[PDB]
């Protein structure tokens, strides 16, 4: 309904613009050049910056350094023997390499906070937050701003809460509450001061909603601050208007909180307000539609709108809203669109978007390859597309990680081909020299076991992957399903010595035997007639069911009957078959269902929840190189070793080699 609301708001804005231009002076009818169907809030700030740059005071203040021919002679005259003071703008510098490390023109120490405390009435606080060294905590920055009695506008309050928000973003997840309480205290300080002139505007509320999104407080961001901004808007309009930044903060809060309906409602409120949204707003809307599609898929797998087919109609029009205004595609738009199309089970749109990303210019963003492999997960015949996608990372500058290999083996396990997983492992995974996850080994042996006509080279790769997984550590416990699928591979290959030698590994890890493993050993003994196995092997597998604890199954009577063929009479096996025939008849007389061997399920989780082995690194190399937070490296003690300082002739053994103090 977003595209229909966009067309309705566009035609309403066109009709309002036409009646206003015919009521005012009929000047736009005389021009008749163009008419924007939407409104753009960023055009005012961008045009104001572009007109501030071209002002004569800005071009006179940021003049280049005066040359020696412009200052005067070769020297000797005081005041004209050097150039004059050069002032640079850190966002639009008219010189390369603003800072230096020379002996006399050293200027990194003069960029710190305190030299800009001389002029705080003229100061720009966003440029102060972005470009300064050794800044205090933003509560103390607000204390120093209010102590000097400077008339803070909305931009200064937005900059100070943006500094607090950057402090929130750089911190850990378990330490977000105290910095958010500092943000709440700075916000109430900006409210109740009233001398010096401090006003809270829409950017300050947007920064508070962004702080609540960063720390993860839905009930504090939406119910308190967004409602307060809406009350301030509806209480006094035309001086407090909600721009695109406030609704982008609201969409960030709705994404970080998981709330789906509120984000679509505020995007519809953006559309109905006749102003264009940003690209990140459409990315967040596609992320929310992906969350809704994944929730509907989980609800239909478990068993506002109960029709899933209309969610695709309401979702793809958000992608159609990109080409509606101008809204050029970025990388996160491609990521969110492929995530939304994977949430709606449409792989052809993913295969179309991966070519559309290469069409104009878009970097293909290795999470996009995760959704590329995840889109074709339940579609047969695309094996060489997986084999070619893994070869496409090297010309694109990317290297495959463990998530992409688990998704490739998830495809191989769901399509149960087996040869594709071996082809991936042999010439794509061995050269990586990385540690396999237990989900990766589980999906690999699930691909190799359930495949038609397996080979012994799959057994070699599976046992060497098991030994490589045992050589390193893990946090998940998938030992028993991995050895269950390994015994199933030994069943479909007929190796009883490899499966019988693998029982000692299940013993060594303390895992109990189940009926499926001994059923796999019996099926291996049935298919071992060329290789190994005897009439005593099925007796030992009978004893494995007899005395340990394990109750037999309705699949056990198939395997022991197939192992009866071409091996011998074995009267103890015949008594075990009679025992199974009594127990399976008695439990059916009681009324129970015939229990067969259950299959181990294939994990089909989306790649955004696949046990990512990373938390976060919020390090910035600019603050490392420019030495923010006052990073002090102690110099070595008199370790110059320069040739100009030395003034003595160096002789072997010195001048006086052996000197005795008497």
């Amino acid at each position: 309904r977003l595209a229909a609301a966009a067309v309705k708001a566009a035609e309403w804005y066109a009709a309002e613009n036409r009646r206003k231009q015919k009521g005012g002076d009929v000047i736009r009818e005389k021009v008749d050049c163009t008419a924007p169907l939407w409104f753009d809030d960023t055009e005012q700030n961008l045009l104001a910056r572009e007109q501030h740059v071209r002002s004569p005071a800005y071009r006179e203040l940021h003049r280049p350094a005066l040359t020696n021919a412009a200052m005067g002679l070769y020297g000797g005259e005081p005041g004209f023997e050097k150039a004059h003071r050069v002032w640079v703008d850190p966002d639009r510098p008219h010189i390369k390499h603003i800072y230096n490390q020379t002996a006399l023109a050293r200027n990194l120490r003069y960029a710190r906070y305190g030299y800009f405390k001389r002029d705080m009435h003229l100061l720009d606080v966003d440029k102060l937050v972005r470009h300064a060294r050794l800044l205090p905590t933003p509560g103390r920055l607000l204390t120093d701003f209010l102590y000097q009695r400077v008339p803070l506008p909305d931009k200064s309050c937005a900059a100070l809460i943006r500094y607090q928000r950057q402090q929130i973003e750089m911190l850990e997840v378990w330490g977000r509450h105290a910095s958010f309480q500092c943000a709440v205290e700075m916000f109430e300080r900006m409210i109740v001061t009233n001398i010096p002139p401090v006003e809270v505007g829409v950017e300050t509320h947007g920064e508070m909603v962004l702080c609540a999104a960063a720390c993860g407080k839905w009930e504090e961001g939406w119910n308190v601050y967004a409602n307060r901004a809406r009350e301030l808007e509806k209480e006094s309009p035309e001086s407090f208007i909600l721009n695109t930044f406030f609704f982008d903060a609201l969409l960030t809060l709705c994404v970080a909180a998981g709330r789906v309906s509120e984000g679509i409602d505020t995007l519809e409120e953006v559309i109905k307000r006749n102003l264009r949204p940003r690209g990140t707003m459409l990315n967040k809307a596609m992320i929310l539609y992906s969350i809704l599609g994944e929730q509907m898929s989980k609800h239909e797998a478990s068993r506002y709108l109960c029709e899933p087919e209309e969610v695709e109609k309401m979702g793809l029009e958000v992608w159609s809203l990109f080409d509606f205004y101008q809204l050029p595609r970025t990388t996160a738009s491609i990521e969110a669109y492929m995530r939304m199309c994977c949430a709606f089970n449409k792989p052809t749109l993913v295969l179309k978007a991966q070519g559309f990303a290469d069409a104009s210019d878009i970097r293909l963003s290795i999470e996009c390859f995760h959704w590329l492999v995840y889109a074709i997960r339940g579609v047969a015949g695309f094996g060489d597309y997986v084999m070619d996608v893994l070869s496409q990372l090297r010309p694109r500058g990317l290297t495959p990680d463990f998530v992409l290999f688990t998704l490739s083996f998830m495809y191989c396990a769901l399509q149960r081909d087996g040869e594709l997983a071996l082809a991936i492992f042999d010439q794509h995974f061995v050269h990586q020299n990385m540690n396999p996850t237990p989900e990766m080994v589980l999906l690999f042996i699930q691909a190799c076991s359930n495949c038609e006509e397996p080979t012994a080279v799959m057994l070699e790769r599976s046992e060497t992957l098991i030994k490589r997984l045992e050589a390193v550590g893990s946090s998940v416990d998938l030992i028993s399903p991995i050895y269950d699928q390994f015994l199933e591979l030994c069943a479909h290959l007929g190796a009883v010595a490899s499966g019988f030698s693998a029982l000692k590994r299940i013993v060594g890890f303390g895992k109990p035997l189940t009926t499926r493993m001994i059923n796999s050993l019996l099926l291996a003994n049935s298919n071992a007639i060329s290789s190994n196995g005897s009439l005593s092997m099925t007796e030992e597998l009978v004893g494995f069911f007899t005395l340990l604890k394990i109750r037999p199954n309705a699949d056990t009577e198939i395997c022991v009957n197939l192992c009866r063929d071409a091996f011998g009479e074995s009267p103890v096996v015949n008594d075990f078959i009679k025992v199974i025939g009594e127990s399976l008849q008695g439990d059916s007389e009681k009324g129970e269902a015939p229990q067969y061997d259950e299959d181990i399920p294939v994990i089909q989780v989306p790649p955004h929840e696949l046990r990512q082995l990373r938390t976060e690194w919020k390090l910035s190399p600019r603050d490392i190189v420019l030495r923010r937070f006052g990073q002090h490296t102690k110099p070595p003690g008199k370790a110059a070793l320069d040739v100009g300082s030395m003034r003595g002739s160096v002789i072997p053994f010195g001048r006086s080699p052996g000197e005795q103090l008497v």
């Binding site: 005081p78 005041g79 003071r85 720009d124």
Partner: peptide, 26 residues
């Protein structure tokens, strides 16, 4: 945007003091 004129006046006054350094004493 609005406080660039006083910053320009301070910069030109500093340049005028650096030119006053030509006079030397007094």
């Amino acid at each position: 945007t609005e406080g660039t004129q006083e910053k320009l006046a301070a910069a030109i006054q500093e340049h005028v003091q650096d030119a006053y350094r030509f006079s030397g004493p007094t």
